[PDB]
Design a protein around this ligand. Structure first.
Ligand SMILES: CC(=O)N[C@@H]1[C@@H](O)[C@H](O)[C@@H](CO)O[C@H]1O
Ligand SMILES: CC(=O)N[C@@H]1[C@@H](O)[C@H](O)[C@@H](CO)O[C@H]1O
Ligand SMILES: [Ca+2]
Length: 302
């Protein structure tokens, strides 16, 4: 149906504390729980990490090789299972709490990182999670700095998932992120990643969806934008509560997208990972609320 259809794998970006310590501020996803979702048919995992944990000094400096080693382990569990792994610096366009205004530093950051992965054909690169509250020209230039660095590293087979401003939301895309059409890639493998949630404010913090059709309504304009500008997209985060109204909303949203696979390459549920507990949107097996409450809807596309 879609090129890629899967789930986020969260944990390594958890907590506020930098460094933080493994096991008390953050954890990495669990390869067994991933393997279990791969067995359900998923072929795409968006793997979260925090830049400040990978890069303890500056973003152009050297790595925490143990954090990096652990990230690469999770990526390899995915790619060895035959699935695509999207590497997501879950950073909101910010490094150490300040907006990334150095386009050159960000380019070097990505040149170094895609260097780690350049020979893995199953890796994809997400420039940054949910740019927001920042200059719209800077957003564009940071995404192009990422594409430039990634290609400079020799990573040429990999898709690059670019994000816009307004938390890369689908429902606001056409009002803020029109300049993002200007991005260019020598490999022609850019994919526009938007997020969309279904609660009253689109924050993805309530179990309750506005209506049975809210999901479709929130991705309509983005879909026309992609068509008009001859681009391809992906819903890198979505979710809904385990209840009849949201099930109807999620379903309708995915059905609409499935009718527009000319522009929609697929989606990834927010989220799986080992530290969600009783999270309203947990897709972690054996007992996450979405794992048992929503996964039957998703299996339509697997
Ligand atoms: C399963 C494993 O290796 N656990 C270690 C833990 O014993 C130690 O507290 C710390 C330092 O390396 O982090 C974990 O990785
Ligand atoms: C289960 C496991 O291997 N745990 C290790 C942990 O020892 C270490 O604290 C951390 C550094 O982020 O790397 C993890 O992979
Ligand atoms: Ca630091």
């Amino acid at each position: 149906v879609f090129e890629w259809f899967g789930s986020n794998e969260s944990g390594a970006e958890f907590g506020t504390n930098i460094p933080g310590v493994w096991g008390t501020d953050y954890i990495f996803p669990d390869p067994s729980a991933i393997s279990t979702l791969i067995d359900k048919g998923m072929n795409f995992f968006r793997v979260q990490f925090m830049m400040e944990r990978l890069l303890p000094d500056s973003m152009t400096g050297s790595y925490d090789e143990e954090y990096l080693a652990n990230l690469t382990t999770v990526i390899k569990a995915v790619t060895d299972g035959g699935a695509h792994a999207l590497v997501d610096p879950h950073n909101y366009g910010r490094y150490n709490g300040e907006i990334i205004s150095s386009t050159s530093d960000f380019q070097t950051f990505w040149e170094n990182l895609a260097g780690q992965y350049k020979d893995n054909d199953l890796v994809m690169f997400d420039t940054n999670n949910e740019y927001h509250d920042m200059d719209q020209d800077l957003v564009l230039n940071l995404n192009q700095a990422a594409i430039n660095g990634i290609r400079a590293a020799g990573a040429t087979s990999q898709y690059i998932f670019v994000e816009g401003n307004s938390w890369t939301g689908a429902w606001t895309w056409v009002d803020v992120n029109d300049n993002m059409k200007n991005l260019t890639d020598p490999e022609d493998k850019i994919v526009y990643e938007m997020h969309q949630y279904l609660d009253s404010d689109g924050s993805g913090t309530s179990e309750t969806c506005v209506s049975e059709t809210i999901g479709k309504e929130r991705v309509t304009e983005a879909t026309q934008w992609l068509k008009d500008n001859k681009k391809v997209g992906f819903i890198g985060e979505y979710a809904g509560g385990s209840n009849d109204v949201c099930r109807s909303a999620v379903s309708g949203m995915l059905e609409y997208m499935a009718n527009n696979t000319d522009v929609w390459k697929g989606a990834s549920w927010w989220a799986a990972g080992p530290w969600w507990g009783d999270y309203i949107f947990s897709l972690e097996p054996p007992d996450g609320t979405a794992y048992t409450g929503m996964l039957d809807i998703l299996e339509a596309y697997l």
